[PDB]
Amino acid sequence: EVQLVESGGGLVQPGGSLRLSCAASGYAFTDYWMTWVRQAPGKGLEWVAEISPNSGGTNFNEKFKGRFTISVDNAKNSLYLQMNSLRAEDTAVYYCARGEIRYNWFAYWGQGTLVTVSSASTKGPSVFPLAPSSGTAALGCLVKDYFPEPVTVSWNSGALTSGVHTFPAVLQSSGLYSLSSVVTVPSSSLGTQTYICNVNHKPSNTKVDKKVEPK
Amino acid sequence: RAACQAKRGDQRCDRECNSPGCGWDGGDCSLSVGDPWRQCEALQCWRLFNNSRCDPACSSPACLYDNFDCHAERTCNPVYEKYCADHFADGRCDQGCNTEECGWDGLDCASVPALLARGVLVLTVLLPPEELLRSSADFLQRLSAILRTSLRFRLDAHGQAMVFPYHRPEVGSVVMLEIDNRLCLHCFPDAQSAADYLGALSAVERLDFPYPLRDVRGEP
């Protein structure tokens, strides 16, 4: 099956440089054009540039000509986006997409990677349990004080999805992000079962698992 | 342009190179047709192909009938379009669609011996064969309308439509059509002339076919 996995991204200083990777598989790489699309937090989709893996040819959005570079490695079936003179406005989720023959519509897309352009420094989060009281009981995890975004929160290694509510991060006065992940479970299961929140903050290479227990 | 040389035939239509001098981006903008105006006399006919006025200097078959601006009555009425598409080659005669603009109602009213044009029209449609064959009546009708002549799929030894998948590793559809000019007697003598007309419609941004095409051929 067709697969696009994008690597790179995280924190970068203003005026700095960052390279992104998109690893293609499940198809003949030389047969289709490859595209980079960006999306600013809260804003809409924006086409960056494209590259021909067969010819080496490139097409760009005027807005990114000069300061952005596009490259390929046919052997590694990969596409790269080099970004220089990075401004706060370049903070966006960068998607790599496969271009469909002659018309360039995108049926296949990558998962996307967040690029944060800030002078601030990377900080790992602190996971705290939101214990249930005492016929439905609510429990959770408080992912406090971290930078930059994002954090991935799962429950019992993704096996618990029903009633899960991972709230969008809110920027605090300290300049650090904070969020909560809650789950509604039956009261009867609190004593004979186990609830673990799996928090991962890739920019600081942090992986914290917390067992939410009633005090 | 020097940059246009590398952009030639890169399977991406570059408007910068969409000109007769640049070889219509090496066929990238004209559905792989090198030169649709291969035998046309007066040049700048491609510049007047996109208008509606009759330009008699470009009316010749070699000059692609000036997009039929002199022949006509020019387009199938949008109000009747869906009806003509649904009632095309259904066995029953629908006189209101029995015009060159609406594909002569799939020759239902002309049930007249076949007068086939030279060769086989080959279309590489970016649709799976299953999706295409379901919309066969609409596909044929709209093509039979744009080309102003009757079009039907070429048949197998067993008698089935010559619609095959394009590029087996991934996927695309290869459609082999026949041109019937029994109600014609302007008109297309072979498959390659019709291919050049479709290629010319692409180049001047005038192709109104709802089916995404990769390329258009003419093989014997």
Place this chain on the structure above:
Amino acid sequence: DIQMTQSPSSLSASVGDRVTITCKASQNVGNNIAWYQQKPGKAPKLLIYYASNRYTGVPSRFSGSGYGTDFTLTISSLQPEDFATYYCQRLYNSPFTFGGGTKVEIKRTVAAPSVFIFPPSDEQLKSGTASVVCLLNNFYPREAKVQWKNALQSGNSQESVTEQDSKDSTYSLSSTLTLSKADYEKHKVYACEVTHQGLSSPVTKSFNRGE
């Protein structure tokens, strides 16, 4: 540069409604237009390609129409999952300009919030800070008032709302009251008063420090 203008920018419709989204191009693009559906925090999904062709797997309710400049995306009967942002895209020629985006929200019946209060964890108190969290679960409409207390606290709380649910079209709110270990251990009663359209009288969930 050919512009892609989407209308409206935001829309609110009920389940079963006929939804109409338009995308207008500054210059003629013919059939060179594609439609996409993007759900929160996920990659866009292709719906319609080359003005009217529906991509494999896309339900029959999604339809595309138009030629030249004026194009339309139609959802015959809106469904709770159809809550997303919809984008049109210019095809064939570079730049492959995307539209502004059209956010589709869903009108639902009034749902009362389930209120829950969480005390700061013992491990957090060791760090020096104390965070008290009040949760409002599965409610409609979005508009809700959260008051922290018996002494109404102001300027020390931050709110967070989830995007509309894919199945029941409800929202969920989280309010976090931030204090210090000194100020927290200085008081006993902690309460969060919730005001919402689905509640006859404001619901208050409280706890007593230590207990």
